[PDB]
Design an enzyme around this catalytic site. Structure first.
Site, short mmCIF file in Angstrom:
data_model
loop_
_atom_site.label_atom_id
_atom_site.label_comp_id
_atom_site.label_asym_id
_atom_site.label_seq_id
_atom_site.Cartn_x
_atom_site.Cartn_y
_atom_site.Cartn_z
N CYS B 108 4.11 49.38 -2.62
CA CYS B 108 4.03 50.55 -3.44
C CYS B 108 3.28 51.63 -2.73
O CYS B 108 2.05 51.56 -2.58
CB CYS B 108 3.39 50.24 -4.78
SG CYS B 108 3.38 51.64 -5.89
N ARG B 111 0.10 53.98 -4.23
CA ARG B 111 -1.30 53.52 -4.39
C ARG B 111 -2.44 54.53 -4.15
O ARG B 111 -3.60 54.24 -4.43
CB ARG B 111 -1.55 52.24 -3.57
CG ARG B 111 -0.77 51.03 -4.02
CD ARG B 111 -0.97 49.88 -3.06
NE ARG B 111 -0.03 49.88 -1.94
CZ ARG B 111 -0.09 49.01 -0.91
NH1 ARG B 111 -1.06 48.09 -0.84
NH2 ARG B 111 0.82 49.05 0.07
C1 HEM Z 1 2.28 57.23 -9.04
C2 HEM Z 1 3.62 57.18 -9.00
C3 HEM Z 1 4.28 56.06 -8.19
C4 HEM Z 1 5.12 56.21 -7.20
C5 HEM Z 1 5.57 57.59 -6.68
C6 HEM Z 1 5.50 54.88 -6.74
C7 HEM Z 1 6.37 54.50 -5.75
C8 HEM Z 1 6.88 53.22 -5.59
C9 HEM Z 1 8.08 52.94 -4.81
C10 HEM Z 1 8.94 54.03 -4.10
C11 HEM Z 1 8.29 51.62 -4.82
C12 HEM Z 1 9.46 50.90 -4.11
C13 HEM Z 1 10.66 50.80 -5.04
C14 HEM Z 1 11.88 50.32 -4.28
O1 HEM Z 1 12.09 50.68 -3.09
O2 HEM Z 1 12.70 49.55 -4.87
C15 HEM Z 1 7.23 50.99 -5.60
C16 HEM Z 1 7.12 49.63 -5.82
C17 HEM Z 1 6.17 49.01 -6.57
N1 HEM Z 1 5.27 49.73 -7.29
FE1 HEM Z 1 5.04 51.86 -7.36
N2 HEM Z 1 4.83 53.95 -7.49
C18 HEM Z 1 4.09 54.66 -8.38
C19 HEM Z 1 3.32 54.08 -9.31
C20 HEM Z 1 3.16 52.75 -9.47
C21 HEM Z 1 2.40 52.18 -10.58
C22 HEM Z 1 1.72 52.99 -11.72
C23 HEM Z 1 2.43 50.85 -10.42
C24 HEM Z 1 1.77 49.83 -11.35
C25 HEM Z 1 0.59 50.21 -11.82
C26 HEM Z 1 3.19 50.56 -9.22
C27 HEM Z 1 3.41 49.29 -8.79
C28 HEM Z 1 4.42 48.89 -7.97
C29 HEM Z 1 4.73 47.53 -7.67
C30 HEM Z 1 4.04 46.25 -8.18
C31 HEM Z 1 5.91 47.60 -6.75
C32 HEM Z 1 6.55 46.36 -6.13
C33 HEM Z 1 7.12 45.38 -7.14
C34 HEM Z 1 8.50 45.08 -6.61
O3 HEM Z 1 8.61 44.40 -5.52
O4 HEM Z 1 9.47 45.57 -7.28
N3 HEM Z 1 3.63 51.74 -8.66
N4 HEM Z 1 6.40 51.99 -6.06
#
Ligand code: HEM
Ligand code: HEM
Ligand SMILES: Cc1cc(N)nc(CCc2cncc(CCc3cc(C)cc(N)n3)c2)c1
Ligand SMILES: Cc1cc(N)nc(CCc2cncc(CCc3cc(C)cc(N)n3)c2)c1
Ligand SMILES: C[C@H](O)[C@H](O)[C@H]1CNc2nc(N)[nH]c(=O)c2N1
Ligand SMILES: C[C@H](O)[C@H](O)[C@H]1CNc2nc(N)[nH]c(=O)c2N1
Ligand SMILES: [Zn+2]
Lengths: 402, 404
Positions: B108, B111
């Site tokens: 992610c 972060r």
């Molecule tokens: C602030 C805005 C956020 C952006 C711009 C963002 C961006 C991303 C992106 C681009 C991915 C990859 C998705 C993919 O390629 O399929 C991702 C995965 C992930 N994100 Fe975020 N994220 C954000 C907020 C969060 C939040 C709030 C959480 C939880 C609190 C989070 C937890 C996760 C987790 C656990 C994954 C991996 C789980 C998996 O393997 O599907 N992210 N995030």
């Protein structure tokens, strides 16, 4: 045990059983993975040798057979008394071909079959070396119809030093530490361009000054060799619609020819063994031309394209990256020069997977290098799971000789 | 040199050594013989040490470490588990625990914002109607009229034999994918099985291309109720390209809230089987994976046609051009709707900050390069030239089985 490698665009699921053929270990451990990282006895050679020999004759019909009988003996003898052997020419042609096939970073692997192995294991002076280079380059350029090839210079010695090509490609542009922290021409080529000056060469101030060759025979002072202009074939870069592109006066060369790698084969080691395929338009477009640590021309062309640098969110960076690439592609098809766009190239690699998945049940691949620097998710490879592991014979990186 | 791994940044020449990975009390799938970094996916005595661990972490965040409050809350968790095979987290450490798992998530890029996640305890929850309301509140809060805030809601954990809480839907918002009987699909083909599982449950399907799936919600054992969402509550964004006129005509749209709902949040041994989290989108997500993946909505083909492009051959480079335009279209329309969004350059620049932070703080940041680096303009982003180290840390998000 044996890994499930699935394609995600097609739900298709295979198994890699080829891994178990890996002797040499890599960086990853159960605890943490370092896939992303760019780099890292007597009787033991007899085993690499051995295992290479089984490979060899299984390659031809004559598997575990009747010349495979006594050939494994000439080696028995030749390390037995002198602690190092020499390869038969047929055996070396196998090693090259194989070692390319074995290289998990090379997307151009569909081609590993067709490859020209020039043999230079009879090279003594650095003079002779040079000649071989020009000749490799002549055969390899082939007036613009490019042909994959690899001249192979002497295998390094238990005793003495090494034959080494100091250049990290046979063709390259100079990089000129100006006076203001500034850099003129290829910045990836500064430290090197300094060595030619240091070994007394006439430099330019040209953006695309082709560098001469620093070749080194064992335990000898590197010699310089200005490269007959006619062998280096270069392409002006224009653009199918933008009239203003060739104003920029960007050019690139045809022959990508790595020279600073180490051909490891049947346990033996080749310190010089230059090799040259053909380019994938993104290497020229995206990295070579756009990397900040390089020529870094993105902003230039973006202003030209009347776009908006002010903010990232106007995608000006992606917009230029695509013209420059598109420019690079055009140019070669204009100048009758072999080139391969990322799409077309990854499609065939896809093939090579299956193709090898058949032959030898698997094939090692470094996903991150296999997926293109722009538009990644728009190639198939991006959706195909890969497994990366080290397979002898293969090419190996080596510390610079200074 | 150090007994830890060297991490170079090929653009700036800088180095750091990741020493956080020393703490990975969990195994990945790469081994010294072969690397499986690319693969998408690869309690009696122990439940103690896992909490023992987590508590230490807690009392570190507060910097009241080694103290008697520490050892007393240590001598309490055993008290409870020792006597019943389980324990419950104080609410303050759930708040910590949640942020730490996000902070931990090697995939992610988000972060940079890890410390600004806003946690809703819903461990009191007991029916499913309850689940649906808590959830609404979440969306309500986190959508916040397009100026979006990161949030998670936590539902009661697992137990010794006692139905899990589970949200069947993968995200809290995903469009119906209706299988035509001419072989094709209409809408999001990602969600076929789930759209199927909903009619199979009495939702009457719509027939558009962007119909919002009804929400499937399971309570402990009670086999799952099926709830619908207030149309005014699910902020959608229709898509226009700023310069190209005919895009809006393509009828494309997207939803504001990306709400992962099918994951497991794991803290100190305890498992939270339903506990969804929302953030905000990154242009490419929508404009490359969602709308362009051939497995998905797959618009690239049509858009190039509209762009007058030569699709007969690839040397024309039509995929890339069309993609860039679709993304520019995604960024424009969110921008203009005044709805939080982030471009890829801007998302990575900021990940690179986060890395520089996490180095000061924990001494390392685990990351999936293959997942961190964007699906277009790969190298054009700073992250691409960033060697990374992936490894598992707890608290953590886990992927979990589909419940059926
Ligand atoms: C602030 C805005 C956020 C952006 C711009 C963002 C961006 C991303 C992106 C681009 C991915 C990859 C998705 C993919 O390629 O399929 C991702 C995965 C992930 N994100 Fe975020 N994220 C954000 C907020 C969060 C939040 C709030 C959480 C939880 C609190 C989070 C937890 C996760 C987790 C656990 C994954 C991996 C789980 C998996 O393997 O599907 N992210 N995030
Ligand atoms: C013929 C068509 C070829 C194509 C399309 C091609 C393309 C490529 C590309 C794009 C890369 C990645 C380079 C990078 O990421 O900077 C690569 C890597 C590599 N290829 Fe090829 N190549 C071709 C021919 C060859 C040949 C003939 C050989 C062996 C003689 C070869 C051996 C390698 C090796 C050893 C690497 C990794 C080297 C390193 O990391 O320094 N390729 N290839
Ligand atoms: C300086 C340097 C350092 C390093 N660690 N790795 C490399 C290898 C990566 C690299 C850089 N420039 C150029 C290439 C050429 C790769 C290449 C080789 C061939 C034969 C054909 C083709 N199209 N492309 C490869 C280079
Ligand atoms: C088999 C499988 C495993 C896995 N770990 N993830 C997935 C889903 C991948 C996936 C697809 N669309 C969306 C997401 C979540 C993206 C996402 C989540 C959050 C919280 C913020 C943000 N900007 N983006 C994840 C599938
Ligand atoms: C840090 C990262 O591993 C490094 O820059 C890699 C990433 N991907 C690449 N991909 C290609 N095709 N070629 C490369 O040299 C690299 N370099
Ligand atoms: C085969 C490959 O690992 C797979 O397609 C991965 C690649 N990188 C990814 N990166 C992100 N961010 N999200 C993904 O779903 C994927 N899919
Ligand atoms: Zn690995």
């Amino acid at each position: 045990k044996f890994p499930r490698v699935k394609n995600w665009e097609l739900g298709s699921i295979t198994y890699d059983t080829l891994c178990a053929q890996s002797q040499q270990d890599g960086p990853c451990t159960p605890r943490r993975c370092l896939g992303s990282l760019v780099l890292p006895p007597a009787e033991q050679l007899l085993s690499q040798a051995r295992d290479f020999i089984n490979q060899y004759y299984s390659s031809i019909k004559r598997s575990g057979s009747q010349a495979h009988e006594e050939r494994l003996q000439e080696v028995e003898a030749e390390v037995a008394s002198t602690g190092t052997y020499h390869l038969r020419e047929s055996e070396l042609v196998f090693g090259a071909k194989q070692a390319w096939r074995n290289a998990p970073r090379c997307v151009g692997r569909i081609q590993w079959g067709k490859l020209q192995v020039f043999d230079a294991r009879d090279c003594s002076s650095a003079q002779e070396m040079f000649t071989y280079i020009c000749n490799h380059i002549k055969y390899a350029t082939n007036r613009g119809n490019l042909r994959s090839a690899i001249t192979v210079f002497p295998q390094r010695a238990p005793g003495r030093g090494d034959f080494r090509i100091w250049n990290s490609q046979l063709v390259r542009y100079a990089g000129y530490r100006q006076q203001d922290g500034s850099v003129r021409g290829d910045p990836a080529n500064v430290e090197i361009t300094e060595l030619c000056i240091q070994h007394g060469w006439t430099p330019g101030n040209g953006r695309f000054d082709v560098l001469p060759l620093l070749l080194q025979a064992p335990d000898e002072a590197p010699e310089l060799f200005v490269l007959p202009p006619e062998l280096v074939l270069e392409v002006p870069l224009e653009h199918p619609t933008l009239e203003w592109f060739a104003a920029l006066g960007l050019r690139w060369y045809a022959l990508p020819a790595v020279s600073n790698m180490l051909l490891e084969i049947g346990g033996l080691e080749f310190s010089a063994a230059p090799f040259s395929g053909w380019y994938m338009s993104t290497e020229i477009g995206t990295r070579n031309l756009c990397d900040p640590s390089r020529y870094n021309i993105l902003e230039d062309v973006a202003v030209c394209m009347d776009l908006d640098t002010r903010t990232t969110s106007s995608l000006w960076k992606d917009k230029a990256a695509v013209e420059i690439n598109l420019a690079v592609l055009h140019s070669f098809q204009l100048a009758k020069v072999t080139i391969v766009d990322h799409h077309a190239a990854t499609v065939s690699f896809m093939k090579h997977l299956d193709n090898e998945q058949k032959a030898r049940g698997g094939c090692p691949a470094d996903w991150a290098w296999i997926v293109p620097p722009i538009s990644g998710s728009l190639t198939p490879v991006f959706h195909q799971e890969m497994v990366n592991y080290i397979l002898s014979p293969a090419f190996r990186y080596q510390p610079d000789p200074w």
